[PDB]
Amino acid sequence: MFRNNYDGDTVTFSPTGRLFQVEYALEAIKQGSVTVGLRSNTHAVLVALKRNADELSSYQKKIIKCDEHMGLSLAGLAPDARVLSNYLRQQCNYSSLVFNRKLAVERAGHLLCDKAQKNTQSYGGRPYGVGLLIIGYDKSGAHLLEFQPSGNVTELYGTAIGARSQGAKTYLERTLDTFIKIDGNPDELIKAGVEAISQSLRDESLTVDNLSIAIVGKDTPFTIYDGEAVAKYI
Amino acid sequence: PPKRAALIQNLRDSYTETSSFAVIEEWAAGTLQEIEGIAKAAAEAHGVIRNSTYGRAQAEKSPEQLLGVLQRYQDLCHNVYCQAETIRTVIAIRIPEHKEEDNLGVAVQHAVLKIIDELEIKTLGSGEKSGSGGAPTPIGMYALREYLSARSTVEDKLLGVDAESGKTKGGGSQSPSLLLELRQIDADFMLKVELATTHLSTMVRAVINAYLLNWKKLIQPRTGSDHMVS
Amino acid sequence: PPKRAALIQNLRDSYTETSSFAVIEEWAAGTLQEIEGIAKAAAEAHGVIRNSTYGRAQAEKSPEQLLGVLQRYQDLCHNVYCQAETIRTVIAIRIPEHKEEDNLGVAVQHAVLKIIDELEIKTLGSGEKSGSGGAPTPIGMYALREYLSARSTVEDKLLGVDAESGKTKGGGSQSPSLLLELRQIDADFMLKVELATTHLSTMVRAVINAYLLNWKKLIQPRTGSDHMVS
Amino acid sequence: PPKRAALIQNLRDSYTETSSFAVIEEWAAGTLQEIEGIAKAAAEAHGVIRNSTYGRAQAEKSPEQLLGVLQRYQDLCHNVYCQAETIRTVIAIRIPEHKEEDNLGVAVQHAVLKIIDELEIKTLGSGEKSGSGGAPTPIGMYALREYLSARSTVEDKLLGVDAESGKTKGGGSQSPSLLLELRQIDADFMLKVELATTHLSTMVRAVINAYLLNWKKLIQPRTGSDHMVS
Amino acid sequence: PPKRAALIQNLRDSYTETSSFAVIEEWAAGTLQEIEGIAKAAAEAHGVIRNSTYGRAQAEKSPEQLLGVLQRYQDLCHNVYCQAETIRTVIAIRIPEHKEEDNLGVAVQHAVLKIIDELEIKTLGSGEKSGSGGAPTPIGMYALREYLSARSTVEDKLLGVDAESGKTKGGGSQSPSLLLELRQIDADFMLKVELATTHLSTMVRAVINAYLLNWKKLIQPRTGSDHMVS
Amino acid sequence: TGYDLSNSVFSPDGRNFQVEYAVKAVENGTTSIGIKCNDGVVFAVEKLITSKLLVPQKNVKIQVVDRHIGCVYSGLIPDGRHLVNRGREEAASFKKLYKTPIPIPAFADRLGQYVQAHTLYNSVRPFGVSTIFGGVDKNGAHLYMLEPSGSYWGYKGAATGKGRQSAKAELEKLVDHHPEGLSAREAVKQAAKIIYLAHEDNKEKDFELEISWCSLSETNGLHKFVKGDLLQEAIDFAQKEIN
Amino acid sequence: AGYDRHITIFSPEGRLYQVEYAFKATNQTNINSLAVRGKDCTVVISQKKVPDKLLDPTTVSYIFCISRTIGMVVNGPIPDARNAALRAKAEAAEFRYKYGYDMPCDVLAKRMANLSQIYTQRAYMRPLGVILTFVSVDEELGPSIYKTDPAGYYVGYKATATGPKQQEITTNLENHFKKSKIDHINEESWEKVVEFAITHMIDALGTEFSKNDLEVGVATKDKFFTLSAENIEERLVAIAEQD
Amino acid sequence: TDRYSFSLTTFSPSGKLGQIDYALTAVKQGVTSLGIKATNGVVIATEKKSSSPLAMSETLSKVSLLTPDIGAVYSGMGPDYRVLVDKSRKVAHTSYKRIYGEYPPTKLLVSEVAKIMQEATQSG
Amino acid sequence: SEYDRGVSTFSPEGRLFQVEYSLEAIKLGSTAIGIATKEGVVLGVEKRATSPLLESDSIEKIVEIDRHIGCAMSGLTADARSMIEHARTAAVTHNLYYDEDINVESLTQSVCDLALRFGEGASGEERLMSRPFGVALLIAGHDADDGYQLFHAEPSGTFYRYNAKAIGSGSEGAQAELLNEWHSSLTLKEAELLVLKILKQVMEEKLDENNAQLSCITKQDGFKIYDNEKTAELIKELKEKEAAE
């Protein structure tokens, strides 16, 4: 007694109209580390908490470049992200060589949605197990997005995904009026992101080894700050 | 349906998670030490009967010390069975709409409910009319009743019973074994309390663990979250 | 088939959803408080017997206070069992055409019907001739009958049997345990009413929740909707 | 096989759908009101016994009013069980060739047949020798027999013994409880008729619905139609 | 939930793996030799009764050497059943969160728990009220009780029993077979201890092996390891 | 049942449950409505603000096809965009062949035939959305509403989503007290109204309204987004009547 | 234990129920249709139930124009029938192209009864749950009527019926043809024949029709046409007195 | 029922392909049909059954011409026969008449047809 | 109990058990150990032969990818041969296109983008091979940008860089020990006796230069696989220090 004959394939609707295999996927995003993103009117920021195995292994990165004006952070199955971020790098390059115009961020959403799309409507496969927070700076200034494996890309002002991400999202939801106005100054937009992320720590605290950051905006091509260089925020 | 919503609301407010958690804390400290207490209370009571010689004198009175244990036991079972029904009432009223999907939590509910009922069965004991599993359960919480009924039948064959004129005899025995059996009925029912309580410890400790782990799912069997549809 | 349609119509008009919903409201307020009432009524009645000393005097009369509880209980079971059959009659007549498809609602119907029957089994009680599950059910609604039959058998052994002609006698009960058993039979049957009612609370509260949630599917097991075919 | 065809033909002509539909109409009106009648007939008869005081006088005669109910009941069960066998005979003879395909209708047949047998089991009652499910069924249609047998055993204990001269008696039975039990045996068997009939209403109303819906499939389990092959 | 974590912690600290491993070592040496000892103790006791002639003299006293064995046995069962409940308490409190995945270890836990309960059933013995499997289990740990009850019934038939003026006898007995039966009751209950212990050896040796192999999984049913997600 | 597992399979009564469940997922999404005024039509969808961190004016749910077709749906959002991109090719290749921008009625089949198809093979999942769309061609304006089985028709105005009935009764009405084509401008207005009234099922979740329209006189044949001033008016012209 | 799940497995008695079930779906339409042939015309009848004040009836038919001479009526879901309507609608075009002449009714029906056979033996898809009725005025048989089903069957009908009411509309005709002892309706013009069907149908159903409860089309000397909305009211009037 | 009769690819423990026999059942059901060989001729016949006389049976053949020297009939599933026929009249040109300038002998057409009949089998 | 039979099936808690079992396949391999030092990197493995008639060198548990990259595997051998092959082609090709040496991690990268090709069904592209590889890799190398690096490749598709790591049946106890030994200022000869020591420990059989293979790589001479005499005396020289302290 008590089975669920509707969760075997991404290609089956449960009596109520739910796609359980896709649901289970999101569940794997929750099991991954946390990552935060927030933006003003001159920059966007990604703050991530790298994880690791032993005191001997390295911390697995989670920030990825895509062009001089675009990037994302991830949560969940590393490989899936690779494929996705990669498909993205391609889409931007086309829109660059052929038309000679920097791919707008919203577009990058549609694109990542329609690709994630295909995997929820056909037999044989499985849905991507990974969420991404994309940031960029097109002709409409700053931009932040949040994509989920169901193909749902939503454009926010800030956010976090990952285990315990909850607390950080709360924080961001209050400090909003404050940072949405941090224009012209990047160093403060990041200190904000770092505060918000700490609202999600339980084991340790952020050290120079497990903290990653990234920014992009007005006069700041997407660059990533790693280790020994993010010290002035710890 | 604003009134139908009300009824269900008041129901779950009468028996919150706090009500059942309190029951677990009590079992954690108080109730467990009490069982361990009743354990040795009848342990030494069994040692006494082992070093005694029974004569016609002991058939003319019921050992008050033993009635003190079987009573103290019946009391404990009573409490537990009621404290359990509390935990059960907390869950039963939180079993969601019957569906053919999203029953991952519901399964947990039914699972714990089963272990609880298995506990209530032990305390309630065997009885005298029986469930297909028999009476492999030590002794019910009606030990007092069964005990007096067992001893009573033997006190009639021994003192025997009667009339007058000429001699009080009537029938008594010579069966030397029937006298030793009166001694065993006092010894056994004291052993049955040792065991019944030893196992009852285990059972209670189990339910505590089982509860403290799955409690979240017990209260929230389903976690609504429509992020896909919009 | 215009007449066959009629019969089925009148049937469902005699027992509408309103009929069964009323039963649930009654159980929500009135019926539950009554059970909680019978609970302590026999609780204090059990405390009294615990602080009393039994002599030959108590074997020459049946305690009217206890007969007052076992009666007040038998009355409550009677009502519930009838109020349940009401809810069941409301569903049974709404079980659709037997098919091999579209039984999502039907499943709900059968499910609730089962929990209801489990309730009716508790109230109806054990009896004296038994169902493979035994008599793990506290005490039937025939407590009065079983009680007098239990006490009666002991009042003969302690009261005596004296048959006559003036030249020989019969006898007067010496087993000290047989006297204490008369005391326990009054104590136990009072405890059996505490438990039976504690569990009966839980059961009723459960059925209320179970009903209030699935009621829509209980009345409308299938929702016709041919939007594809045309 | 022109003769083998005949036999099966005459069989189904003896018990047509009209035969079983008549049975349903009777249950719709006549038979249901009768059960509701026997319901209160024993309801007020139970109220009377509740407001009476029993003495030795009532042990020297059997209450004719009660024998009037248990008899009027046994009569109704008798009829139903026969009217059911009618409906069953209508189906049983229309169960098609045993196949491993096209059993959508056959399933309906077996389904209804099962509900009917469940009805026949209730009316036939429990008995005194028993089916793995026990005797959770109220009272058989042999109430009369069981009743007199129950009261009879108690009328001997109260009465005992009784040889006469007006100055001494025999017996016994001073047990005050044994007298009250004679009062309960009259009260219980009257309650058992209330319940047995309340549930019997539900069961009958159910079978009516179940029949009126699936009747087409009951007569025509398979609908031949070879439009593809030619 | 920092307090809820505490309770579960203290629980598992009270009954560590060391507690249960100690029980296994005891069974490995001490407890097994003891059973093998009780084995031949009743083996030679059975040989004695085979080479003896029973007369009225042996019905006027209970063979103390037999009582020495059945007692020494009841003692061993007592201990084992308690040492088992120890091992069970060690596992029951380490059954993880109810899930629908990663139950490879949980399966092992339940498996061993079952073999342990099968052991506890043997030691606890049959009894006198019975589980669907019957009483294929040799003799319970209530051998003493059943033995005296069996012999007692026969000692009343051989001896007779009296009262006074007329003749001391009163009850009491040709049948040459009834005398031989008193001889068999002593022989059988000695054989029942041989067998019960032979099988009890096997059972214990099995549980030892079963434990020593799966113990790792018994304590650590699930091994967390999220190397993929990050 | 074993007839609700596969997508191709027929139940004994010729019932395809997998498509039906598809609908259950549609009548749970947000609410989408479609108004057909005299010359042109009007569309409107209910966007749900879950949190305060949601740049407003962004995350649009209405898509234009070619440059004369409105298009809105409810249910699985990704399935949404999808069904439309196809519509976008289907459109384009058609104009590239015949020159004349695609006939609103023609367009619908293309989409139906496609959705149609996802009910034939058991290796794919039926579309989880109900779609409403329309535009103005050579024969004026038309307004259709396709669904999960590929079934569809022409409407005077319609809507799907969690709260559609209220949207319908308060929709049939407008028809009765206006039997003769509504009003270009007025449609919009009454549009923003029909949504609010229907949002009372999401009450506790503040929302954002989005309207687009297409009309031979205000848009000039082309489909445009209702932003700016007329966008406000229509809101209040509805917020007022909400009292 | 699933014979009836796969369109390719034979039951111990060579059944293939999936094909069978296919049929019941051709009934959940709840529309009845009969077609009778004149002497130089052919007419099909079908009811037009529109259960919604919102659906604009113009877009609510079950009879399409395959070619400029052949017309078709379908007893099934608008999605599935709309498919078939298209394939056949195209077989026509291509046939003409590849052979120099207009494709006959009797043929098109065989391309379809064949198409829905290969469709069903190779298992490349689920069988469409509809019945197709092909009518026209052939130049080698004039009054022609052929009807295919899901199992890949077809044949000629002197005038047939389809719907939840086979026999009624049918037998009623068997007794009318049992008299005239001929195999066709006699009359110089369509107008009059039309009147004959409506007439000879209300008789079997037991209900009156207006200019919206029905729907009819007819075939002339190479020129298939659907009966107008208002015009259907006409013959309805004329035959409301000559009773 | 077996667990071997639902796969063309499966041999029962004895060695009998299954789906084939059930297919062969739909045939042992179809309407009766016969054929008699003479010395100066051959006759093939089969009965006709009307769904209803409202249908024109003179627009649906049952005895078909494959070649102007060969005809054939059947018993079993109607629809199959209709196309199995047109595929036979072709495999009669493309496979013989168009290679040898003449129509095919009886024996070889029957085998060219059983060839198409074969395919239906060997292949799930 | 029910979700562990499909490589493309998420368990209710978002897990892919078939992948997990994949890994569990490696534990069955014999131990492999890698220790990185600012002097070079070392790789050692337990050979473990069923018979004395086997030819030792027949068991290639340590191999060369290129003059500057070597590695040791653990798990299914047939599955290994395929990765080793791809890896080698990857290196050589890059050389051809750039006239330079492939970065150790960029090589490791291509090895993982290979395992990433499991899954059968057809939801778009196409990657022919049913399940995950049953093997892990210890890739020791060196390049001008990040010096001596050591990696761990898993069939999951991810990888980490280590200072020292052990895989195979014994990675349980071996990894513990290494956690309490490794330190940035280890000399090459020091790490050799350490890899050698931990094997002997959590290994099993008497540690002879027949059931234990040892190798290393350096900027100076690239990947070299220590011959038997060397390892042999490195063992004696090892087992000796055990007497005193």
Q: Where are the domains of chain F?
A: 1-243
Whether C170 contacts D195, CB under 8 Å: no
Whether E227 contacts A53, CB under 8 Å: yes
Dihedral of alpha carbons C147, C150, C154, C156, sign: positive
HSE-up of residue I147 (Cα within 13 Å, Cβ side): 8
- Residue among F1, F17, F20 minimizing CB distance to C100: F1
Give the 3-state DSSP-derived string for chain F, with helices as H, strands as E and coil as C.
Answer: CCCCCCCCCCCCCCCCHHHHHHHHHHCCCCCEEEECCCCEEEEEEEEECCCCCCCCCCCCCCCCECCCEEEEEEEEHHHHHHHHHHHHHHHHHHHHHHCCCCCHHHHHHHHHHHHHHCCCCCCECCCCEEEEEEEECCCCEEEEEECCCCCCCEECEEEECCCCHHHHHHHHHHHHCCCCCCCHHHHHHHHHHHHHHHHCCCCCCCEEEEEEEEECCCCCCCEEECCCHHHHHHHHHHHCCCC
* The two structure tokens encoding residue I184: 């940035």
The answer to whether the CB atoms of E152 and B181 lie below 8 A apart is: yes
* The two structure tokens encoding residue C133: 């599950």
> Residue G133's domain spans which residues?
1-243
Whether D212 contacts D87, CB under 8 Å: no
Closest-CA distance, E227 to chain I, in angstroms, reads 9
Using alpha carbons, select from G130, G135, G83, G73 the residue that is nearest to residue G104.
G135
CB atoms within 10 A of CB B33: 9
Q: Which helix (H) or strand (E) holds A38?
A: strand A35-39
* The two structure tokens encoding residue A85: 């971020």
Q: Is C103 on the interface with F (CB under 8 A)?
A: yes
* The two structure tokens encoding residue F101: 């921008």
Provide the CATH number for the domain around residue A195. 3.60.20.10
Q: Is F147 on the interface with C (CB under 8 A)?
A: yes
- The Cα I242–Cα I219 span in angstroms is 32
Torsion of CA H114, H118, H121, H122, to 10 degrees: 170
The full length of chain G comes to: 243
* The two structure tokens encoding residue C128: 């004296």
Sorted by where each begins, the domain ranges of chain B are 1-220
The answer to whether the CB atoms of D101 and G151 lie below 8 A apart is: no
- The Cα B162–Cα C171 span in angstroms is 5
CB atoms within 10 A of CB B76: 18
What secondary structure does DSSP assign to G63-83, as a single string? Answer: EE-SSSSEEEEE-S-HHHHHH
CATH topology of domain D1-220: Four Helix Bundle (Hemerythrin (Met), subunit A) (1.20.120)
The answer to whether the CB atoms of G29 and C228 lie below 8 A apart is: no
Closest-CA distance, D101 to chain G, in angstroms, reads 7
Closest-CA distance, F151 to chain A, in angstroms, reads 18
Task: From chain A, pick out residues whose CB is under 8 angstroms from the CB of I132.
Answer: none
Q: Is H78 on the interface with D (CB under 8 A)?
A: yes
Q: Which helix (H) or strand (E) holds I40?
A: strand I40-46
Looking at the DSSP assignment, which residues form a beta bridge with residue A212?
A48, A226
Closest-CA distance, A219 to chain I, in angstroms, reads 29
- The Cα I243–Cα I236 span in angstroms is 12
Task: From chain H, pick out residues whose CB is under 8 angstroms from the CB of D226.
Answer: 29
- The Cα A195–Cα A174 span in angstroms is 12
Q: Which residue of C has its CA nearest to B164?
A: C169
Residue with tokens 């992948």: I19
Q: Which residue of G has its CA nearest to D225?
A: G20
Euclidean distance between the first and the last CA atom of chain G, given in angstroms as a whole number? 58
- The Cα C115–Cα E202 span in angstroms is 44
Looking at the DSSP assignment, which residues form a beta bridge with residue A217?
A43, A220
Looking at the DSSP assignment, which residues form a beta bridge with residue H46?
H33
Interface test with B, best of C24, C177, C204 (most B CBs within 10 A): C177
- Residue among F113, F157, F172 minimizing CB distance to G86: F113
φ/ψ of I169, rounded to 5, equals -65, 90
- The Cα D120–Cα D143 span in angstroms is 16
Using alpha carbons, select from G114, G153, G46, G202 the residue that is nearest to residue H55.
G153
Task: From chain F, pick out residues whose CB is under 8 angstroms from the CB of C103.
Answer: 1
* The two structure tokens encoding residue B200: 């009852």
Torsion of CA I127, I132, I134, I140, to 10 degrees: 70
The answer to whether the CB atoms of C212 and B8 lie below 8 A apart is: yes
Using alpha carbons, select from B59, B157, C175 the residue that is nearest to residue E156.
B157
- The Cα D73–Cα D122 span in angstroms is 13
Distances (CA, A) of B62 to B72, B176, B184, C176, D134: 16, 20, 14, 6, 38
The answer to whether the CB atoms of F48 and B228 lie below 8 A apart is: no
Please name the residues in contact with F47: beta carbons below 8 A apart, sequence gap of 6 or more: F30, F59, F61, F207, F208, F209, F210
Method in brief: X-ray
Q: Which residue of A has its CA nearest to E100?
A: A3
Residue with tokens 């009296």: E162
Interface test with D, best of G6, G9, G11 (most D CBs within 10 A): G11
Using alpha carbons, select from F194, F74, F93, F197 the residue that is nearest to residue F145.
F74
Query: CA-based angle B74:B75:B81, to the nearest 5?
Result: 85
Task: From chain A, pick out residues whose CB is under 8 angstroms from the CB of F4.
Answer: 15
The answer to whether the CB atoms of C229 and G29 lie below 8 A apart is: yes
Dihedral of alpha carbons D30, D36, D39, D41, sign: negative
Distances (CA, A) of C139 to B80, B117, B146, D55: 19, 17, 16, 28
The full length of chain I comes to: 245
φ/ψ of B160, rounded to 5, equals 95, -60
* G159-162, strands of its sheet edge to edge: G159-162, G33-37, G42-46, G216-219, G225-226
- The Cα G59–Cα F158 span in angstroms is 14
Task: From chain I, pick out residues whose CB is under 8 angstroms from the CB of E223.
Answer: none
The answer to whether the CB atoms of G59 and F153 lie below 8 A apart is: yes
Query: CA-based angle A133:A138:A144, to the nearest 5?
Result: 20
Closest-CA distance, F26 to chain A, in angstroms, reads 8
The answer to whether the CB atoms of F149 and C228 lie below 8 A apart is: yes
C touches which chains (3+ CB pairs under 8 A)? Answer: B, D, F, G
Q: Which residue of E has its CA nearest to I4?
A: E101
- Residue among I10, I156, I164 minimizing CB distance to A25: I10
Task: From chain A, pick out residues whose CB is under 8 angstroms from the CB of I122.
Answer: 122-125
Query: CA-based angle B217:B219:B222, to the nearest 5?
Result: 60
Torsion of CA I103, I107, I109, I112, to 10 degrees: -170
Query: CA-based angle A32:A33:A39, to the nearest 5?
Result: 120
- The Cα F146–Cα F9 span in angstroms is 22
The CATH code for residues I1-245 is 3.60.20.10
Give the 3-state DSSP-derived string for B115-163, with helices as H, strands as E and coil as C.
Answer: HHHHHHHHHHCCCCCCCCCCCCCCCCCCHHHHHHHHHHHHHHHHCCCCC
- Homologous superfamily, domain F1-243: Aminohydrolase, N-terminal nucleophile (Ntn) domain (3.60.20.10)
- The Cα B97–Cα C101 span in angstroms is 21
* The two structure tokens encoding residue E81: 């059943």
* The two structure tokens encoding residue A122: 């056909």
φ/ψ of D66, rounded to 5, equals -70, -40
Closest-CA distance, B99 to chain C, in angstroms, reads 8
- The Cα F147–Cα F128 span in angstroms is 9
Strand F141-146 to F129-136 pairing: antiparallel
Q: Is I2 on the interface with E (CB under 8 A)?
A: yes
SS3 of D57, please?
A: helix
- Burial class (CB within 10 angstroms; exposed 0-12, middle 13-18, buried 19+) of B138: buried
Q: Considering its fold, how many domains does chain G have in total?
A: 1
HSE-up of residue F225 (Cα within 13 Å, Cβ side): 13
- The Cα B137–Cα E89 span in angstroms is 17
- Burial class (CB within 10 angstroms; exposed 0-12, middle 13-18, buried 19+) of D121: middle
Whether G34 contacts G161, CB under 8 Å: yes
Whether A84 contacts A77, CB under 8 Å: no
Whether C59 contacts C158, CB under 8 Å: yes
Strand I62-66 to I40-46 pairing: unpaired
Euclidean distance between the first and the last CA atom of chain B, given in angstroms as a whole number? 25
Whether F145 contacts F26, CB under 8 Å: no
- Residue among A14, A19, A176 minimizing CB distance to F52: A176
Q: Which helix (H) or strand (E) holds C162?
A: strand C161-162
Whether D173 contacts D194, CB under 8 Å: no
Q: Is C230 on the interface with G (CB under 8 A)?
A: yes
Chain A positions with Cβ closer than 8 Å to F: 5, 10-19, 106, 110, 113-114, 116-117, 120-124, 150-152, 154-159, 169, 172-173, 176
Using alpha carbons, select from C183, C8, C165 the residue that is nearest to residue C96.
C8
- The Cα E208–Cα E204 span in angstroms is 6
What secondary structure does DSSP assign to A47-70, as a single string? Answer: EEE-B-SSSSSPPB--EEEEETTE
SS3 of G150, please?
A: coil
The answer to whether the CB atoms of A19 and B107 lie below 8 A apart is: no
Q: How far is CA B25 from the centre of its chain?
A: 19
Q: Between C64-92 and D176-219, two packed helices, what is the crossing angle to 10 degrees?
A: 0
The answer to whether the CB atoms of G82 and F172 lie below 8 A apart is: no
Euclidean distance between the first and the last CA atom of chain C, given in angstroms as a whole number? 25
Residue with tokens 């009903």: C211
Dihedral of alpha carbons F79, F80, F83, F89, sign: negative
The answer to whether the CB atoms of B205 and E82 lie below 8 A apart is: no
Burial code (b: 16+ CB inside 10 Å, e: under 16) for F80-100 equals bbbbbeebbebbeebeeeeee
- The Cα A128–Cα A86 span in angstroms is 14
φ/ψ of F133, rounded to 5, equals -165, 180
Provide the CATH number for the domain around residue G170. 3.60.20.10
Q: Is A152 on the interface with B (CB under 8 A)?
A: yes
Distances (CA, A) of G110 to B93, G175, G222: 63, 30, 20
Using alpha carbons, select from E209, E107, C4, E19 the residue that is nearest to residue D24.
C4
